[PDB]
């Protein structure tokens, strides 16, 4: 039935958020479209935490379609925790109108994590297997009612960081170059699949063997097992800064190795410019350490990603 495009705005390569409207008449929120979770929630008026006061809060009093459902919601994103209550209301994402969509309305958001974040809420795009009890992921409702023309969505993130796009129910050949390589999903919870090897110059330095990796648009870095990451941090030239981090000499870029992920028989290199992030006069390393690899924005900025729920496939194509 439909195709929606949502322009994303980026809080400096760390979050990839967009506008959604909730309630009748609609109230506006900015949300993080999150392929590593499946729950949808926005702050409410019942939330008194400072983070809530520094953001948009849903006022059910002004919505003619709201309906409390009462069921609790606790989501523990390491970073910060969020407590709320489930309810129902209409959501609008571009032109696609998603009626009686369950949505979490925070009640407590303690801590600084959420205060300083640029989004108001999180909209979960992983499998229903991940979603909290009584919560129905937004794409699943869209799908279930033939609201999208195809049961796929597509992520374009711009490295030049200004025309980032989420496309619902469509693939756009103009944001990629070459062909799409379809990779099957091994475990349907996150968007998970099998990487064959991580090599530097024909030498395998991580994931010796095969390893599982998830495609998470809600993680900024490339995250891996710390043994494998440490070796990658030596290999590229990365040192630990006093702050507990890994820095790279910004003027050393030209000589640093390219890192290659071999996914289902194709190679997806990561150039130095691609895994090297520079803010102000200092440069930091893209790779971070936690068994499962998390291919964050570092990889998705380079590879236009299609998430296909009809077929349970990930499709990768080099980003433009």
From Swiss-Prot:
Broadest EC class assigned to this enzyme: hydrolase
Residues of the Peptidase A1 domain: 16-317
Keywords, comma-separated and alphabetical: Aspartyl protease, Digestion, Disulfide bond, Hydrolase, Protease, Signal, Zymogen
Reactions performed catalytically: Broad specificity similar to that of pepsin A. Clots milk by cleavage of a single 104-Ser-Phe-|-Met-Ala-107 bond in kappa-chain of casein
Tree of life domain: Eukaryota
Listed GO MF terms: aspartic-type endopeptidase activity
Enzyme Commission identifier(s): 3.4.23.4
Record annotation: effect of changing residue 250 to D: Propeptide is not cleaved
GO terms for biological process, alphabetical: digestion; proteolysis
Role of this protein: Chymosin is synthesized in the mucosa of the abomasum (fourth stomach) of young (unweaned) ruminants. The enzyme hydrolyzes casein to paracasein.
Subunit structure: Monomer.
Name listed for the protein in its UniProt record: Chymosin
Organism, scientific name: Bos taurus (Bovine)
Record gene name: CYM
